[PDB]
């Protein structure tokens, strides 16, 4: 397993200049994938978590930002953590990021949780960096191994039966939570349907009801849809990610939905800051901001 | 009705690496190229793959290939009558050449595929893909 050895090496670059890589062995990574995969399937696809807890958004391979995320929020098991997906792609150190998160999940399965983002899908990360990073620093067989692990990540989490958490947002097909729980793993993320929307959909102020999403997949939803959703299921907040917000956090539909993003200066093309959410035993919510055609005969 | 609350206390702003300290840019990502490769890979997954082993004769392997998309796939256009491929019978027109001597020819460049097919010898090991019924 080498779990303590793996984590120690991953944290050894804390004080180095950012960009320095940590090269784990192929077998160690495969161990982390095969064992985290085992835990993911032993736990419900729809998580039921209890406070205290800290909620974080996209990372996208910005490994050192994840460290400062842990440094200020408290390394595990000092604090319980729930991530909303998008750990890989668009960054130069996705492998370090996902390994550290998977290691903590194996080490602290009941106090550390990871949700599936739209980039934890083979059809997407094959294009936006993770496959290339696996090919360069390992073999593509390792990328297939990450796919089998990602296909078993949980989709959504409900905190204290009152806060609903997922990467993307709501779906017009979502009537009861049993529709989520019936989803069987391992599964790819289809181009359409409930699972797709949970990982892709966005809130939009200018939309009444449902609307088409500029990403070319899934939909956009307005404030009324949020309020009705919370009313019908006796919830009071939707916590999600998947959109860059300049202040690391951003509310929507009064205080009924919040967007979290934990990758400062997203892929070096934004000014945005990162942020996280802390929920205590009394369900108090606070914000910590991480501000910087051919032929041939044979 | 609500059982949650929110904090009016000030917001804590911890500092983080600048852009000079931490260069988060990544110009290596090339979605256009990867997407072209991935589309070819998707088609192969839906194909019926079977092995084939041909012994080269005087004429060669008796196969004529065509590239189809940059990132190309290798398909059979002609099977010369009397050649090794025809006499074997398992290779037919429009069969994709997924692998040759263990080297993948899905989403490759014409230069790459030509180099591989020119370096074959004697008993060439093929992986052939055919459209499922
Ligand atoms: Mn996303
Ligand atoms: Mn994202």
Numbering used by the authors:
A (entry chain A): 7 to 298, 1113 to 1118
B (entry chain C): 454 to 522, 530 to 593
Share the article's original sentences:
Phosphoprotein phosphatase 1 (PP1) is a member of the PPP superfamily of protein phosphatases, responsible for most cellular serine/threonine dephosphorylation. These ‘RVxF-ΦΦ-R-W string’ PIPs include Neurabin/Spinophilin (PPP1R9A/B), which play important roles in PP1-dependent regulation of neuronal plasticity, PNUTS (PPP1R10), which regulates PolII and chromatin dynamics, and PPP1R15A/B, which mediate translational regulation through control of eIF2α dephosphorylation. Biochemical and structural experiments show that in contrast to the Phactrs, substrate recruitment and catalytic efficiency of the PP1-Neurabin and PP1-Spinophilin fusions is primarily determined by substrate interaction with the PDZ domain adjoining their RVxF-ΦΦ-R-W motifs, rather than by recognition of the remodelled PP1 hydrophobic groove.
In the complex, the PP1 catalytic core and Neurabin PDZ sequences were well resolved, along with the 4E-BP1 PBM, which was docked with the Neurabin PDZ domain. The individual domains were largely identical to those determined previously for unliganded Neurabin/PP1 (PP1(1–304), RMSD 0.22 Å over 269 Cα, PDZ(501–592) RMSD 0.39 Å over 65 Cα). However, the PDZ domain in our Neurabin/PP1-4E-BP1 substrate complex structure is oriented at 22° to that in the unliganded Neurabin/PP1 complex, reflecting a slight bend in the C-terminal section of the 5-turn α-helix that connects it to the RVxF-ΦΦ-R-W string. The 4E-BP1 PBM, 113(QFEMDI)118, uses a beta-strand addition mechanism to make extensive contacts with the Neurabin PDZ domain, similar to those seen in other PDZ-ligand complexes, that widen the PBM-binding groove: 4E-BP1 F114, M116, and I118 side chains make hydrophobic contacts, while their main chain carbonyl and amide groups, and the C-terminal carboxylate, form an extensive hydrogen bonding network with Neurabin main chain residues L514, G515, I516, I518, and G520.
